[PDB]
Amino acid sequence: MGNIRTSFVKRIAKEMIETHPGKFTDDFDTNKKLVEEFSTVSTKHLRNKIAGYITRIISQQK
């Protein structure tokens, strides 16, 4: 096996979301704008995974 390496991405997500408590609106558009109003992640297509990640956390949270 090797290293896991994924928790750091989760930390970036936290930093991005937690800067604005507009959380748990369980909509893709909401999380989209939530990401775009902050955005601290490199790689433009990686933003997609971030937006989906938020939505995923939210849907499982409820």
Name the structure determination technique. NMR
User: Please, what is the Cα angle at 57 between 50 and 11, to 5 degrees?
Assistant: 55
Report the domain count for the chain: 1
Taking CB atoms within 8 Å and a gap of at least 24, the contacts of 37-42 are 40/12, 40/15, 40/16, 41/12, 41/16
Contact 32, 17 (CB under 8 A): no
Q: Which of 42, 3, 39, 44 is nearest to 54 (CA)?
A: 39
**In the structure encoding, which two tokens stand for residue 18, read together?**
């937690």
Q: What is the DSSP letter of 43?
A: S
Q: Which residues span the domain enclosing 37?
A: 1-62
Q: Tell me the CATH number at 62.
A: 1.10.60.20
Q: What is the DSSP letter of 27?
A: -
User: Please, what is the Cα angle at 28 between 40 and 46, to 5 degrees?
Assistant: 35
